Amino acid sequence: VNPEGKISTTVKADDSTASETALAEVAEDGVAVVDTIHYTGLVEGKEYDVTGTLYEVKDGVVVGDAKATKTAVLTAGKDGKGDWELDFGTVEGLEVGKSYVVYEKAVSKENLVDADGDKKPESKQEVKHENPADKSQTFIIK
């Protein structure tokens, strides 16, 4: 049966964690950015190519080129549910007064999805979280 993947995220910028109810605030060398990926409906023990992208955002609209990208190879935990940490490290060249949002993609290394329904997987499982208006993935530099 085909896996039904879902991901949400929570960003931490410097010492400051965002949440469903408030974006993270960073006090005016670079900003340490860590994104937590909350996943369900992945395949236990399978490896995923995870790509995080940091964008400047203005009123829930992405502006300009990515400020940073980070990739990792992470393994799905028990029942294909759990949390991953994607550490971007220090991100240089962010601007005081500006807001940033994290986008995430995870693509399985193995074929985990039977897209043509012959009961044999032939497609990668791909999950995305690309919401420019998600305050839990957003931080502002004060």
Ligand SMILES: [Ca+2]
């Ligand atoms: Ca197939």
Ligand code: NA
């Ligand atoms: Na979230």
